[PDB]
């Protein structure tokens, strides 16, 4: 359960980071 | 570069949590 | 779109924290 | 107090994101 | 249980950060 | 510098986790 | 101690934003 | 505009955290 929660959080941060990276592209 | 590094770290964290989730199963 | 995802992320976080808070109450 | 602070912080963030989502309409 | 897995994860992350600090220098 | 700051946050988390872990010990 | 750590995180955020603000100036 | 607003908000947050840190001691 906690692993799942951590994965969801990391996935959100990764998508956020990706949109920032694309904005700077 | 900052956003890219954060995206990479977050994707590694997500993979690591997924692996833990699959192991805990 | 960014704002909407951030709000969803935060709601999920609040729900997790609330659960923790309730366990400690 | 830790969990309660975390809950308050998450709820604050959710409120701010929601206000932002509404403004961006 | 939860705290021990969280301490272990946090230590791994700190080591990864430290490695990156040394590589970047 | 970012890696250094990441490291401090990670160390902070690990010590908070250890304090909880010791109370559960 | 938690408030002191939160202050440090907020200061880091402020410096990061200031960096961006200056480059955008 | 965005970076300036983020800087302002982070500074507000830091002052709040500092005030709390001083109240607690
Ligand atoms: C917050 C979570 C961050 C965890 C980062 O873990 C590291 O991620 C790096 C990728 O940036 C990897 O390359 C490295 O091997 C790994 O240890
Ligand atoms: C607020 C963040 C919380 C903790 C974040 C921890 C992030 C650390 C991930 C960085 O990982 C590094 O990235 C690169 C990939 O090769 C390398 O350079 C380095 O050698 C590796 O270690
Ligand atoms: C709970 C709010 C925290 C928000 C995000 C975490 C902020 C982490 C910033 C670093 O804070 C410092 O971390 C040091 C070790 O790295 C500690 O040294 C001891 C120190 O005492 C603490 O001040
Ligand atoms: C990878 C992300 C990590 C998540 C957060 C981890 C942060 C770890 C501690 C950072 O250290 C802080 O760095 C700030 C910025 O370098 C400094 O503020 C500096 O800049 C502020 C912003 O104006 C001023 O208010 C301060 O006086 C000035 O010291 C502050 O003193 C220092 O303690």
Backbone φ and ψ of H21, nearest 5°:
-55, -40
Q: How many Cβ pairs within 8 Å bridge chains A and C?
A: 10
Q: What letters, b where the CB count within 10 A reaches 16 and e where it falls short, cover A12-21?
A: bbbbbbbebb
| Count of positions (residues) in chain G | 25
Closest-approach residue (CA) in chain H for G23: H3
Name the residue with tokens 């230590």: E11
Closest-approach residue (CA) in chain D for C18: D7
Residues of G with CB under 8 A from a CB of F: 5, 8-9, 12
Measured N-to-C along each axis, helices E2-24 and A2-23 cross at an angle, to the nearest 10 degrees, of: 30
d(CA H9, CA H5): 6
**CB of residue G25 inside a 6 A radius of ligand 3:** no
The domain limits of chain A are: 1-25
Chain B residues touching F7 at Cβ < 8 A: none
Cβ neighbourhood burial of H21 (10 Å; 0-12, 13-18, 19+): middle
Name the residue with tokens 């989730």: B21
Measured N-to-C along each axis, helices G2-24 and H2-24 cross at an angle, to the nearest 10 degrees, of: 160
d(CA H24, CA C1): 39
**Token code pair at residue A15:** 């998508």
d(CA C4, CA D17): 7
The closest of D17, C3, G25, E16 to A19, measured between CA atoms, is: C3
Can you say whether the dihedral through the CA atoms of E11, B8, H4, F4 is positive or negative? positive
Question: What are the distances in angstroms from CA E16 to CA B2, B12, E4, E21?
Answer: 16, 11, 18, 9
Residues G8, H18 contacting (CB under 8 angstroms): no
Resolution of the deposited coordinates, in angstroms?
Answer: 1.7
d(CA C25, CA D1): 10
G and E touch per CB criterion (3+ pairs under 8 A): no
Residues E18, F3 contacting (CB under 8 angstroms): yes
User: Which residues of chain B form beta strands (DSSP E)?
Assistant: none
- Report CB contact under 8 Å: A10, B4: no
CA distance B18 to chain F (A): 20
The closest of F15, B11, F10 to E14, measured between CA atoms, is: F10
- Report CB contact under 8 Å: C3, D20: yes
Chain F residues touching B5 at Cβ < 8 A: 2
Q: How many CB atoms lie within 10 A of CB E15?
A: 14
Experimental approach taken: X-ray
Provide CB contacts within 8 A for D10, sequence distance 6+.
C10, C11, C13, C14, C16, C17
**Token code pair at residue C3:** 């704002």
**Token code pair at residue A1:** 């359960």
Q: How many Cβ pairs within 8 Å bridge chains A and E?
A: 3
């Amino acid at each position: 359960a906690x692993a799942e929660a951590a994965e969801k959080a990391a996935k959100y941060a990764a998508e956020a980071a990706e949109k920032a990276a694309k904005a700077x592209a």
